[PDB]
Write a protein that binds this DNA or RNA. Structure first.
Ligand code: ZN
Ligand code: ZN
Ligand code: ZN
Ligand code: ZN
Lengths: 791, 791
DNA sequence: CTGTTACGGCTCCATATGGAGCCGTAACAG
DNA sequence: CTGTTACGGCTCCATATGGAGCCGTAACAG
């Protein structure tokens, strides 16, 4: 009725816990990273609600949506349909923009049709219908095409065509025999240079024969057939239109340009003649949300116009107010939804959900406050509480103190992670958790544990990285200086351009200069001080592997030492074994039946592929003869089965393994097991693995680390550990640059660069620079204002 | 909040109506057929709720579910997600049965794992996993295959292979050249008879070469290639497994047989050794729902077993009780869900929804009481009220008096249909509608209008249709006699076998004997009295056309007369025109640009095909020169634009057109227009069109009409009109047999055949026979008991 | 004029190879 | 012993023609 009773929850590492979540209330789930709160929420409640709603729909719709796996839960009662909002974005299609996603373009079209004065039909203003879409660009506004300068950057035999699937290097490839047939038809030499080729022949080859029929001969068996040359450009365009990695690869060689006729207006030349208050539809859509709302509020109409357009104006004002209160007062209604970050997309989805007014729906949010400045926390909390107040329930998974102080109910898991977590430690109001003596969240909220402000701060040693003439996006031609050898943190409000300035300019230029990559840096003049750097490393939450053949033991490189010490035993020496025998990636020591994968594929008549453990090897991925070899009473499979904490004690007598295992333990991965597949690892686990690998390396003092919000989905203890690890890395001799919005991390940094003073058009500048104490003295700085009370 | 406010509803024929539907209440929508209530419910509320829930899901899930069209409504507030339940069934896959659909097989597996005594793992009892599925049948229980007796029912050149896609009649077809290559390889003559062919050669041809590689030569251009013969049977099996019309066609030639090892148990020989109370899993699943519930209630366990299996037993008992209270006390848990009727599937879905306990969801049901006997009305109403009471709202679209008397709120549309309906006439409680003087439902509920019991009933003239030895399904070898020349109605409780006995036996045998069709009748001895019949006609709600080239004017045949009178004018005579010129199906009088379709196809870069009216012809489907010809001030397009009611007055001077138009008016289609596409017609409109076509024919007195519940989705006035039409058809000279569950239709019949006395195993017999007055005197008959008070 | 049958024409639905990232191994320099 | 570079091998992901039903037309019988 008024509760969500869950019994027998055993998904992932949950230790058969029973919980009662009050309905129509603000509920937050807390715990350490990997403690199972994310599993308990998403894999149980969201999955059960989505399955219960989908299975009751039409058969075709259910088949299209797929067959969701049934969670390992006894029974759940009082479960309304669940909608999950998380930081995930897709390119999707160019047809969708911010206005269409937020469902305000329809209201704008209705208003323009009803009251717009021509210089009147709602479908005339839409670019998704032939009645309004521009004839040339088909309502897209961007004539995407592949320029000839990129297809042929040398004769054909030297590798002129760099496009995938058109490599004429192979003699028997389709491209080779098509080129041979074309050369036979047009009587030209393939080995002739492209520049020396006649323009007509080159144009015919590039753009095809335009439907002309030619004879093509193919040899395996021999035969002949009649067909036509489609052309490289036409085939690439058709492949692009047929269907995200392939889309990104195709768009890499593309050259986006504005439509020559509509100039990106996406509409016919006659639809733009209708204006409201001196601004047509495109000009209104080009304004930022705040100024558009101000213009709508200040708009003056006659009595008849006000009576005929009251409801549309009220709806537009309400939606714009919701969007502003969410925090996106800098975005434009005409901006493409594809070029949006995860936090911006999540906030837009939240605003749309608030505007829709759906009732009786369980809402689950995964860290809505990440990627958002501290000044917008109150607005975000007010929006969340309004969404709850409209007749819904919230299951936010957050680790922010303000969220705990604003939430009605708090559920805490733990007390550790992995095999030590998965059970509820404490629950109730914030006061009850604060008074609870066995809760980590209560301990960190009551002041028992805290992050201390360092007494001594490092200073630059005379090495600086100067970026000159940065003008990409909203950057107003600013020059910044990043000291080398100290912990540098870059702050600023959302949309100020810090993320672009770092990721798409500094990292790309450093990679091109040092790692010898092939990327296009952002619009800037030059970078000074690169000679002081030897390598650039970027650490993110991307998975460390896409195959089941990768595990942390191999990634950290400790598996080589483990195999060496295994082969150094007397049994392997007497049996003539090698260090490579104890590996599930090379034939000789792996199971032959399962090919070392450990699972087998079974095909059903009317079901997808089902995987079961291999019968002969029992999932140990090794043959019996190899497994007979034991080192100190444990075989290779048992060693792979140990966790990092146990491996620390087991391998304490071998320094070369002990150092790596201790690094893995210190980066907070003491609950993980060496045999875990890299595919099953989460973002935090992958980031910790990368940090451990970086720590295990021998630093030369000329390395730069770039991190983009490393505190995503991290508890207070995790933040403390990450701060300690970053300080250790800085003290090693390298330099660390972090884009952070967390005050706890910010206050421990040695240098702070602030970008503001606003977001969007008003941003792109530099407000404050120096140590946090110096930045706190700047009056016109939000970060300084917050650090004034934080310190 | 507590209301669903809809403003500006203009979908289909709705005349801009505003309504307020109370939330969490029993609401019923009433109106005439075609008045727009179905549109107002499904196209507006269900569509808006489904779109609002889908658009907030993941991008991939939203793309898979498709892009739902936005309804033509201003705004809807307080809209919870909507689930629509309607009478629609699909073959789907053999993996799903009644138990799996109702989610009781999982609980049965859990109970068997926990307390079953072997002679213990939940996944061992499931047939959807390799751990429990039978190795031979792969957990299907039916080895579906194509028998050789059906592939070759004459030499190859005479058409031995009757399978689609393997017609060797064409010389250049792939089948022909494959057969030629096989004949060249094996050195045999294709023209040789199949019987005279060696068994080895025939087996090799039928089952392929089993991977053997042979040389195949093909001619258009000439060439050769190496491949293997897959075989007809293997190719057909692969095509069947690749992917409903094609599935039905493939299954027509299939021969379903039980698995030789498991005997249809779908499980391994070891999983059936576990028994509970002397019955294993398959034997429990083979019992009917009522007796299974009785067995579970009477089951005795020890204290430990009761303590360990209390929750599972309680859940199973509750679900079985819900299923029994729904009305399906005769179904078996092991029955395949594919072989279920629309009403049974809808009731099963309702029971599953009740068991799931989803809260805050709007439920829309389309005639849940159709196909259900009168004795189950109270149980169905109680189930609906319980489903509402668990915290939901109901939007049932029903025309049953008991539903009106049980509903909290009633919304009435009308007052007519088509252009006369689409607006709300009255609303409120049942008393308010009864006291309303301008409501058709109130008029029929207050006794102002009623269907009178006929004073005189027709009697048989000595012609009878005797079915001897009917034994299909649950029929217990019964003999029935259907009189010819009178209105015969067949009644009985659900599951008594009347539907099978009629549709799959009598209609099929009559079609085979008279219409010279190719179908397999049900298991019966013979039928006597066929010599008194000349033709058999079956009328259902299936669409009358699948192309936009069919309209009621052509279907009824009146369009030929219209074209003839158009060509008989002086303008056509002077211009040398013919009767075929005024047709949008032959070149010469239709628009060349749109090819007479009236619409054009426009392709977008990243959108599906969009259809817009043709520019040159303005959607009139005719060229200008043809349109210049006018008859009595109206051209052909204007004539097509007229409705039946207007065409009745326009064509009153031509008897050959007036008779057909009057028939169309009398069958209740006075609101439809002659130019309406047959694809857009609903089931009721198609049935009315078929009835009008049958009436327009010249009856020879030797025709039999078979109707299966013609009162589906019909108001009381529609029922009265249909009864009048059926009586007119009977008085014409033919014989009508109707399977009906409506007491109003039953009381007007001349002969009644009752099948009972129960459903399932207890059915398949004949209880009462004779006139309704005679049937009402039978004590052990539910239909007689109801007719006792009805008459 | 009307019903039936046969034929022609139309429409909608159905049915294998190259590339990026990672692991293991050998060689060379510090 | 350790770091770096180069190479080989492995895996997962990506990119047109026959048939059923209907409409129009002509011929034959009542
Ligand atoms: Zn354009
Ligand atoms: Zn194996
Ligand atoms: Zn079997
Ligand atoms: Zn046209």
């Amino acid at each position: 009725k008024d509760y969500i009773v869950v019994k027998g929850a055993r998904e992932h590492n949950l230790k058969n816990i029973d919980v009662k979540i009050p309905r129509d209330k603000f509920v937050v789930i807390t715990g350490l990273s990997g403690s199972g709160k994310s599993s308990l929420a998403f894999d149980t409640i969201y999955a059960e609600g989505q399955r219960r709603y989908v299975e009751s729909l039409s058969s075709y719709a259910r088949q299209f949506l797929g067959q969701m796996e049934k969670p390992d839960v006894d029974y759940i009662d009082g479960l309304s349909p669940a909608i999950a909002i998380d930081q995930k974005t897709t390119s999707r299609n160019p047809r969708s923009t911010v206005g269409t996603v937020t469902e305000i373009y329809d209201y704008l079209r209705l208003l323009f049709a009803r009251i717009g004065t021509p210089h009147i039909t709602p479908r005339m203003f839409s670019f998704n219908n032939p009645y309004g879409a521009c004839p040339e660009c088909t309502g897209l506004g961007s004539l995407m095409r592949i320029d000839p300068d990129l297809v042929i950057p040398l004769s054909l035999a030297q590798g002129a065509v760099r496009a995938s699937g058109w490599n004429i290097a192979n003699d028997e490839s389709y491209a080779r025999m098509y080129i041979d047939a074309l050369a036979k038809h047009y009587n030209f030499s393939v080995d002739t240079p492209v520049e020396e080729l006649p323009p007509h022949i080159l144009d015919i080859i590039l753009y095809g024969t335009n439907g002309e029929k030619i004879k093509i001969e193919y040899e395996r068996e021999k035969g002949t057939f009649m067909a036509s040359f489609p052309g490289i450009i036409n085939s690439m365009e058709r492949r692009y239109k047929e269907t995200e990695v392939m889309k990104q690869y195709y768009e890499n060689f593309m050259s986006n340009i504005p439509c020559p006729v509509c100039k990106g207006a996406r509409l016919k030349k006659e639809s733009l003649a209708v204006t409201i208050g001196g601004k047509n539809i495109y000009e209104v859509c080009c304004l930022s949300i705040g100024e558009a709302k101000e213009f709508f509020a200040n708009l003056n109409l006659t009595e008849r116009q006000q009576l005929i357009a009251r409801q549309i104006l009220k709806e537009i004002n309400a939606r714009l107010g919701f969007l502003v209160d969410v925090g996106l007062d800098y975005l434009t209604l005409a901006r493409a939804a594809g070029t949006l970050s995860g936090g911006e997309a999540q906030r837009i989805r939240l605003a749309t959900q608030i505007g829709s007014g759906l009732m009786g729906v369980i809402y689950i949010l995964d860290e809505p406050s990440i990627g958002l400045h501290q000044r917008d926390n109150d607005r975000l909390l007010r929006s969340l509480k309004k969404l709850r107040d409209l007749g819904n329930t919230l299951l936010v998974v957050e680790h922010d103190e303000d969220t705990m102080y604003a939430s009605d109910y708090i559920i805490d898991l733990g007390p550790g992670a992995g095999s030590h977590g998965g059970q509820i430690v404490a629950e109730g109001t914030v006061e009850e958790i604060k008074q609870n003596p066995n809760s980590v969240t209560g301990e960190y909220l009551s002041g028992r544990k805290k992050i201390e402000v360092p007494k001594e701060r490092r200073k630059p040693n005379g090495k600086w990285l100067e970026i000159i003439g940065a003008r990409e996006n909203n950057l107003k031609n600013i020059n910044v200086r990043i000291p080398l050898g100290v912990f540098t943190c870059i702050t600023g409000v959302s949309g100020s351009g810090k993320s672009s300035l770092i990721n798409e300019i500094l990292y790309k230029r450093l990679a091109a200069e040092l790692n010898r990559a092939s990327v296009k840096p952002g619009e800037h003049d030059l970078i000074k001080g690169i000679e002081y750097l030897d390598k650039v490393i970027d650490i993110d939450q991307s998975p460390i592997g896409r195959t089941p053949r990768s595990n942390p033991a191999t990634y950290t490189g400790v598996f080589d030492f483990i195999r060496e010490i295994f082969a150094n035993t007397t049994e392997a020496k007497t049996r003539g074994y090698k260090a490579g025998r104890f590996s599930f990636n090379v034939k000789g020591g792996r199971c032959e039946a399962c090919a070392g994968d450990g699972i087998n594929k079974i095909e059903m008549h009317f079901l997808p592929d089902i995987y079961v453990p291999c019968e002969v090897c029992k999932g140990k991925r090794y043959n019996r003869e190899t497994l007979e070899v034991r080192y100190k009473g444990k075989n290779i499979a048992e060693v792979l089965d140990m966790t990092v904490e146990e491996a620390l004690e087991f391998f304490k007598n071998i320094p070369r393994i002990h150092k790596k295992i201790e690094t893995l333990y210190d980066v907070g991965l003491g609950y993980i097991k060496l045999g875990q597949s890299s595919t099953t690892l989460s973002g935090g686990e992958a980031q910790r693995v990368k940090l451990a690998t970086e720590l295990s390396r021998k630093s030369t003092g000329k390395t730069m680390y770039i991190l983009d919000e490393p505190t995503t989905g991290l508890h207070m203890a995790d933040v403390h550990r990450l701060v300690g690890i970053l300080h250790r890395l800085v003290e090693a001799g390298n330099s660390v640059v972090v884009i952070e919005h967390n005050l706890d991390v910010i206050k421990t940094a040695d240098y702070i660069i602030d970008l503001g003073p606003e977001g969007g058009s008003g941003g792109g500048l530099v407000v404050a620079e120096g140590t946090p104490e110096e930045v706190a003295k700047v009056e016109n700085s939000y970060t300084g204002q917050f650090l004034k009370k934080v310190l």
